[PDB]
Structure 1
Amino acid sequence: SHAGLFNLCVVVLIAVNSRLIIENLMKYGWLIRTDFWFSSRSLRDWPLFMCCISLSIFPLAAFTVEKLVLQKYISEPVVIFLHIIITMTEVLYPVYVTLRCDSAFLSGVTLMLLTAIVWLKLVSYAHTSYDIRSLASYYVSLKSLAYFMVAPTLCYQPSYPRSACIRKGWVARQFAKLVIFTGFMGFIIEQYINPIVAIERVLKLSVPNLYVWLCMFYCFFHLWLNILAELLCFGDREFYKDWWNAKSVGDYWRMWNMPVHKWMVRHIYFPCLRSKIPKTLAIIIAFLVSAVFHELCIAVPCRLFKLWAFLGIMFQVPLVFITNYLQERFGSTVGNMIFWFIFCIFGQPMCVLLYYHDL
């Protein structure tokens, strides 16, 4: 119902880390870790911002081809090829910029995350436009496309949802939490995650890392997406179901992200059901279009020659079936326990630590 358990965890982290949290150079800088930890003005991030602004051209090209389809000369497969090559360049060019230019913990990662979101939205816009035009005013269309692009959803036509209320003027009650919460992660990386500045100990290494993920889940999904929905007055405000109450790893993927789940359902599962392709390949396709966006986020900025996250995400397809069998045999409690163990030992948070140890 509320975040009481999260408040308990935050209070526990504050209490156990009493020597450093309470005693720190707070006379001039109230930040827990450093005055400028995640990034600073010294970094040459201006090309990254310039390319982020320039990334808006691909939506403009999608708009112009979608407007140009009304002409009789242009046909369907040429438009499909144009959409495919526009989407391919939209993912290729940021990768080239990130490889050639420098990167950081947040400076280079944000370029890749926006690229995946725009790619998913660009595919979503094209597929929805094709579906709408299949059945037998520039300003309104451009406004709708811009609202879809800025809104916190991966599905076109967000008009049906409507907030129907004035946005909260006192948003600083929420936003002020975020800058505080991102401080705590800045502490947690400093103390717990520091390998080099009996049979195995990776589980002992997985205890703090999963706490970084959930906090990273709280900063983005709970706070930032709700702020985006409220500022834009978007109707729906349910970006994730109770993913922690997942009987298996298969159910976690449906609950942890509702925009991504809905995109996968409407674009990868729905046409496969319409095309008579059983949901045995759709799972691989869904996980293929998730790993490519969970590997470009983490491998592209830093070095990449081993322990690729693509294989880690692709390994989930055995794991969802294995956990489904295990929970169906041993009950919901055992299913939740083995799901948490799998998420700790071979889950998403472990991929970040595998790359941190590499660099």
Structure 2
Amino acid sequence: LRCHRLQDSLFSSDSGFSNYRGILNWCVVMLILSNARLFLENLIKYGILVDPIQVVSLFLKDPYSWPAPCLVIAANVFAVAAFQVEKRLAVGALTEQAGLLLHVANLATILCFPAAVVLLVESITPVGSLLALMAHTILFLKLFSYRDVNSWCRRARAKAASAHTVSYPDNLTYRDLYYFLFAPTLCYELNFPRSPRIRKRFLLRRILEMLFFTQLQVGLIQQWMVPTIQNSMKPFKDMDYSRIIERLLKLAVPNHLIWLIFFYWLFHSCLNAVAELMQFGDREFYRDWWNSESVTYFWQNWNIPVHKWCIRHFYKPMLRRGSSKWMARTGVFLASAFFHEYLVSVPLRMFRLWAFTGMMAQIPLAWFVGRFFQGNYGNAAVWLSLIIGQPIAVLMYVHDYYVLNY
């Protein structure tokens, strides 16, 4: 025919190729080539330990100590309490007002009890504090969705009474609830999709990814960031804006890499390992936030579980139960900022209100990046907005907690 068309190079902006799966395999190949010797070393050196049954027996030796696993186990009380008020109002008792009050009390207690235990106890590690508060905020969102879905499938039955798949009143079983609580999702649903089998190879690869990226994050921190912080061990709350920026410029890129590894290690490897153990089959925990040419598209695709919980339990109901789309969006912003400063600042016992100010500054930044940049330049603007952006607030919190202790 004609050996020469009129086209564009694949790497060009106006080409629209977008088939770069292989820039991922390249990053995997290079991470492995660079960390595989050390990973086999640390795996034989740490995997040879007797961790599994010794740490559990040690914790069982002194309950009421190690208050973070104590909190995580006590969360079952709130789980069972929600299940009880549900299964009790499922038949005859607790007219909707009473059940809604019991559930609101249970939810507010899920939120305010672990915060209290964390603040009013000195023997609780901050990483364990964070695990307790994150488990309890996950449980809070899960039980909020539980209440909402059961209320819906109960109003529907009450209506239709005067006109394989499990119907409404037959899903209130401890098996069901405690499968939902460990499901990689925040939106309750009768008849979750299911995977055919367990795929031992997939689960093994997920566990390997978790171990590898854990060791990689440890490398990143201990060899790029802890040295840089220890060069000038001065808290951010006392430094000035100039010195703060001079230090954050040195700390940003390692912090960004650590956050990318958190995202992968958690929203792909950990959540897929969980969803594979208990066959879950949905497995859309994230969407392509990396090719997000705006901050608004970034937030709507980072953390798909939380976002769809938001959109169908906190934003759509506000539009229904009221008006002012603007007020719904600002309420979503408020809730997200509250949960961020509650996850980052209650474990570290700080309240400098930095995560909140960063979450705020995301707004003018979002308008800026949405208005000025487009396409791949907008995507690069979003990548900048993530390198400094919000993760720098969490970095400031952790930097202050590091230099104020060791």
TM-score (norm 1): 0.85
For 2:224, which of 187, 192, 206 is the aligned residue? 192
Paired with 1:27 and 1:123, the residues of 2 have a C-alpha distance of 41
Residue equivalent to 1:240: 286
Deviates most, 1-10 or 168-177: 1-10
For 1:59, which of 70, 79, 97 is the aligned residue? 79
1:13: how far off? 6.3
Which string of whole-angstrom CA distances, capped at 9 and with x for unpartnered residues, describes residues 28-79 of structure 1? 97369xxx9xxx9999863322221111111211111112224555322222
Change (3 A) 1:185 1:49: same
Aligned length: 342
Residue equivalent to 2:187: 155
Does 2:364 align with 1:358? no
1:160: how far off? 4.4
Contact 2:206 2:272 in 1 (8 A): no
1:310: how far off? 2.6
Contact 1:284 1:317 in 2 (8 A): no
Paired with 1:311 and 1:94, the residues of 2 have a C-alpha distance of 24
Q: Which runs of 5+ in 2 are unaligned?
A: 1-20, 160-167, 234-241, 402-406
Which string of whole-angstrom CA distances, capped at 9 and with x for unpartnered residues, describes residues 237-258 of structure 1? 1210111111111111111111
Does 2:162 align with 1:116? no
Residue equivalent to 1:337: 380
CA RMSD of aligned residues (A): 3.1
Change (3 A) 1:140 1:295: same
Does 2:297 align with 1:251? yes
Paired with 1:28 and 1:12, the residues of 2 have a C-alpha distance of 16
Deviates most, 199-208 or 4-13: 4-13
1:259: how far off? 1.0
For 2:98, which of 64, 69, 78 is the aligned residue? 78
Residue equivalent to 1:177: 209
Contact 2:171 2:190 in 1 (8 A): no
Contact 1:307 1:354 in 2 (8 A): no
Identity across matched positions, percent: 35
What letter matches 2:136 in structure 1? Answer: T
Change (3 A) 1:265 1:242: same
Computing the radius of gyration from Cα coordinates, the structure with the larger value is 2
What letter matches 2:84 in structure 1? Answer: T
Contact 1:109 1:301 in 2 (8 A): yes
Contact 2:252 2:392 in 1 (8 A): yes
Residue equivalent to 1:313: 359
Which string of whole-angstrom CA distances, capped at 9 and with x for unpartnered residues, describes residues 99-139 of structure 1? 12334353221111101100001111111111222221987
Contact 2:85 2:99 in 1 (8 A): yes
Paired with 2:313 and 2:250, the residues of 1 have a C-alpha distance of 40
Paired with 2:277 and 2:119, the residues of 1 have a C-alpha distance of 34
Change (3 A) 1:125 1:322: same
1:204: how far off? 3.1
Change (3 A) 1:300 1:276: closer
For 1:46, which of 40, 43, 66 is the aligned residue? 66
Contact 1:288 1:314 in 2 (8 A): no
Paired with 1:59 and 1:28, the residues of 2 have a C-alpha distance of 36
State the SS of the aligned residue for 2:344. coil
Residue equivalent to 1:279: 325
Paired with 1:98 and 1:350, the residues of 2 have a C-alpha distance of 24
Q: Note the 1:292-311 alignment, pairs <5 A.
A: 292-311=338-357
Residue equivalent to 2:45: 30
Residue equivalent to 1:69: 89
1:167: how far off? 0.7
Paired with 1:68 and 1:50, the residues of 2 have a C-alpha distance of 28
Does 2:156 align with 1:132? no
